C-alpha cells in the first residue's frame, strides 16, 4: 500500500478529517506515528518474546517474508585510517555499514578458509581468555565491539598466524521513514529521520496492515492522554 | 492534568474580590458585545463593529468644514442641529440623505457661547415650516431658531 493508501486507511479507521478548516491529524503526525509503528513491529517480530506467538525472525515463513526486504549483505571496511587502540593484541578493527539495524550472520574469509563469526559476551571473553590456548575453535572467529565514532567498529579476534581478507555482514537494514507528503510545503523544517520528502515504505505488504493498526492504536492512546495507556503501549516499544 | 473549569460570559463585573469572583462574569473587557447584533451572537462574546465617515456635502455639492468645538446637538425629526464654537460661533442643519449629510449654515456670528456652558435643547414639530429648536446655556439668555 503506497503512502496515500496508508493515510486514507488511517482516516477510515481513526476518523480524523482531511479538511484544513478543522485541523485534524497532520500528515507529519501520521508519518511520525507510522515510523514508530514500523520500528516497534520490527523490534517485536524480531525478538520472539516481543510478540504474542513466541516467534522471531526465522521461526515461521511469515516472519521471513516480513523481514525479507530489510535483509542486506555487505562487506566490512578496515578501520586502519584511524590508529586507535584495541583491547586485544590480534584485533583487526573493521567498520560496519551505516544503515545497520540488527546483525544476524557474520563470516570472515581468511587464508585458512571461511570461518563463521561468533558474537562473544563480555563474560565469555574473560572465561575463554583465562585458559591456556586463548584462541577460538578451528572453524569460528570472535567479535567484540570497540571504540565507535558515529559508526559501529568491531574487533575481529581471529586465531593468530592468519590474515583477514574479507568480512561479510548479513544484517537487517534500518527501515526508512513512512512519509505521506513533502513536509517542507506546509511545515518549515520538520523531519522524521533526516527526510523531508515522501518516503514510501520499504517493507513487504504483509506487515503494512500491522503497521497501520499499531499507528491507529498509538494515535488513540496519545489523544487519550492517559498515563496508564501510555505505559501499556510503551511496553511494546522494544 | 487533574481538573477543569468552564467559564461563561454573561456580562462584566467589578468591585468584587478575586477570591469570590463568579465564573459567569468577566472582570474587564474592551470593545466587546455580549448581545446579538448583526448576527445571532447573544451571550457569546463578539467584536464591536467600527464606524464609517459620512461626508458633510452642501446642497451645491461642495464640502462643508465645521468651524470648531461642539457644545451640543438636537435631532428634531431628521434634521440634526449643531451648535459649535470656534473662530466664530456657528449653527448648522444636517439632514441625512442616502450617503451624505445635506449641511447648511443657519448662522455664523458672535452669539456669546462658552465651552464651560454647553447647550441643552428642546425641539418641536408644528408644521412643515415651523420647526423650532429652543436651547439654553447656563450663562446666556435662552434663544430660539427655526
Amino acid at each position: 500500500m503506497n503512502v496515500n493508501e496508508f493515510s486514507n486507511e488511517f482516516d477510515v479507521l481513526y476518523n480524523n478529517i482531511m479538511s484544513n478548516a478543522a485541523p485534524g491529524l497532520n500528515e507529519y503526525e501520521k508519518s511520525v506515528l507510522l515510523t514508530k509503528a514500523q520500528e516497534e513491529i520490527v523490534k517485536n517480530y524480531f525478538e520472539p518474546a516481543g510478540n504474542k506467538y513466541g516467534k522471531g525472525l526465522d521461526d515461521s515463513p511469515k516472519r521471513q517474508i516480513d523481514f525479507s526486504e530489510l535483509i542486506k549483505v555487505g562487506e566490512g571496511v578496515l578501520n586502519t585510517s584511524a590508529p586507535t587502540i584495541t583491547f586485544d593484541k590480534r584485533a583487526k578493527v573493521y567498520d560496519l555499514p551505516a544503515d545497520l539495524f540488527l546483525v544476524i550472520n557474520e563470516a570472515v574469509d581468511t587464508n585458512a578458509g571461511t570461518k563463521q563469526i561468533v558474537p562473544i559476551s563480555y563474560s565469555d571473553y574473560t572465561r575463554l581468555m583465562s585458559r591456556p590456548y586463548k584462541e577460538p575453535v578451528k572453524y569460528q572467529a570472535w567479535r567484540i565491539i570497540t571504540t565507535s565514532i558515529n559508526n559501529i567498529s568491531v574487533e575481529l579476534i581471529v586465531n593468530s598466524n592468519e590474515t583477514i581478507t574479507d568480512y561479510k555482514v548479513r544484517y537487517i537494514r534500518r527501515p526508512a521513514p513512512i512519509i505521506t507528503t513533502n513536509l517542507s510545503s506546509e511545515y518549515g523544517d520538520v523531519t522524521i529521520n533526516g527526510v523531508s520528502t515522501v518516503s514510501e515504505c520499504e517493507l513487504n505488504p504483509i506487515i503494512h496492515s500491522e503497521i497501520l493498526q499499531r499507528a491507529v492504536e498509538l494515535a488513540k492512546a496519545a489523544y487519550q492522554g492517559d498515563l496508564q495507556a501510555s505505559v501499556e503501549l510503551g511496553q511494546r516499544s522494544e | 492534568a487533574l481538573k477543569k473549569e468552564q467559564h461563561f460570559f454573561k456580562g462584566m463585573q467589578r468591585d468584587l474580590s478575586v477570591s469570590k469572583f463568579n465564573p459567569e462574569y468577566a472582570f474587564d473587557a474592551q470593545n466587546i458585545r455580549i448581545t446579538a447584533r448583526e448576527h445571532d451572537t447573544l451571550l457569546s462574546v463578539s467584536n464591536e463593529k467600527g464606524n464609517k465617515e459620512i461626508p458633510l456635502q452642501s446642497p451645491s455639492g461642495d464640502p462643508v468644514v465645521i468651524d470648531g468645538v461642539l457644545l451640543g446637538q438636537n435631532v428634531l425629526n431628521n434634521y440634526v442641529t449643531l451648535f459649535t464654537k470656534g473662530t466664530n460661533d456657528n449653527i448648522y442643519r444636517l439632514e441625512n440623505k442616502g450617503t451624505y449629510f445635506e449641511t447648511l449654515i443657519l448662522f455664523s456670528g458672535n452669539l456669546n457661547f462658552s465651552t464651560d456652558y454647553p447647550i441643552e435643547s428642546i425641539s418641536v414639530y408644528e408644521n412643515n415650516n415651523i420647526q423650532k429648536v429652543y436651547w439654553v446655556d447656563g450663562l446666556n439668555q435662552a434663544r430660539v431658531i427655526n
Partner: protein, 97 residues
C-alpha cells in the same frame, strides 16, 4: 486555556487567526505569550478538532515560572491590526489542584 472561537471575513471562515496575545498575572506573577500557531513545530496556540487551546504563559521574571496560585487573572485579546468578527463562545481552564 481551552476555548471555542471562530473568526470570519465577509462570510468566509478564517480558522488560522483567533487571538494574538494572552496576559496572565496574579499578585506575584505576570506572563505573556503571543499566541502563534506553527503547524509542525510546537507553539503556544494550537487547534485540533475545532477546539482552540493555549498554554498559560510563564512569568517573565523566571521563564521556568508556571502560573501557580489560588486565583489568577486571564486576559485574551487581539492587539494586531485586523478587520474580522471574532465570535468567542466559551473558555475552559484546565488546572492541577
Amino acid at each position: 486555556v481551552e476555548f471555542r472561537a471562530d473568526s470570519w471575513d465577509s462570510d468566509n471562515l478564517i480558522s488560522n487567526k483567533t487571538f494574538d496575545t494572552l496576559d496572565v498575572w496574579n499578585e506575584y506573577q505576570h506572563g505573556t505569550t503571543p499566541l502563534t500557531n506553527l503547524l509542525g513545530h510546537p507553539s503556544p496556540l494550537k487547534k485540533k478538532f475545532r477546539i482552540w487551546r493555549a498554554n498559560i504563559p510563564r512569568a517573565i521574571a523566571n521563564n521556568r515560572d508556571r502560573i501557580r496560585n489560588t486565583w489568577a487573572y486571564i486576559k485574551l485579546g487581539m492587539n494586531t491590526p485586523n478587520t474580522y468578527r471574532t465570535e468567542f463562545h466559551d473558555a475552559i481552564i484546565h488546572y492541577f489542584a
